[PDB]
UniProtKB/Swiss-Prot annotation:
The keyword Chaperone applies. The gene is Mesd. Residues 1-115 are annotated as: Chaperone domain. This is LRP chaperone MESD. The lineage of its organism: Eukaryota, Metazoa, Chordata, Craniata, Vertebrata. The chain holds residues 41 to 185 of 224 of the full protein. Disruption phenotype: Disruption of embryonic polarity and mesoderm differentiation, likely resulting from a primary defect in Wnt signaling. Keywords: Chaperone, Endoplasmic reticulum, Glycoprotein, Signal, Wnt signaling pathway. GO terms for molecular function: identical protein binding; low-density lipoprotein particle receptor binding; protein folding chaperone. One of its GO terms (cellular component) is endoplasmic reticulum.
Length: 145
């Protein structure tokens, strides 16, 4: 196995849907009181501004990516697919900073626009071996320029 067991950055996050297989409901919570996000350029080191109008006109999807889970039983395949979307946002930040891992009857997920910075808290986060939090918003393009 490997925390970086990604399919060359595509839609591995969707794999989380497998969690539904358990349906043990180890946790009763899952959704937290989220809200709008700050609109501004965010990157790990520096973005690549001054881009052409073609690319920009091509498509624009700026959103914040942040989710932490590590338990058995997560019936939310639908919401999973939505994760792939937020992934695009991380691109503008650095270059897709998401990690996935599967062990036993429980799976853990971790996605952040920065990644490295999150790796710090991720230590204790995954160490808990029991967490169910999710956060996804897209107001005023919270991240991507």
């Amino acid at each position: 196995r490997k925390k970086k067991d990604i399919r060359d950055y595509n839609d591995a996050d969707m794999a989380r849907l497998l969690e539904q297989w358990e349906k043990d409901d180890d946790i009763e919570e899952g959704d937290l009181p989220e809200h709008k996000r700050p609109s501004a350029p965010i990157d790990f080191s520096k973005l690549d501004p001054g881009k052409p109008e073609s690319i920009l006109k091509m498509t624009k999807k700026g959103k914040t990516l942040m989710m932490f889970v590590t338990v058995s039983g997560n019936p939310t395949e639908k919401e999973t697919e939505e994760i792939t979307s937020l992934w695009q946002g991380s691109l503008f930040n650095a270059n897709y900073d998401v990690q996935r891992f599967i062990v036993g009857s429980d799976r853990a997920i971790f996605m952040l626009r920065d990644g490295s910075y999150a790796w710090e808290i991720k230590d204790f986060l995954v160490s808990q071996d029991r967490c169910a939090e999710v956060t996804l918003e897209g107001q005023m393009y919270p991240g991507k320029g």
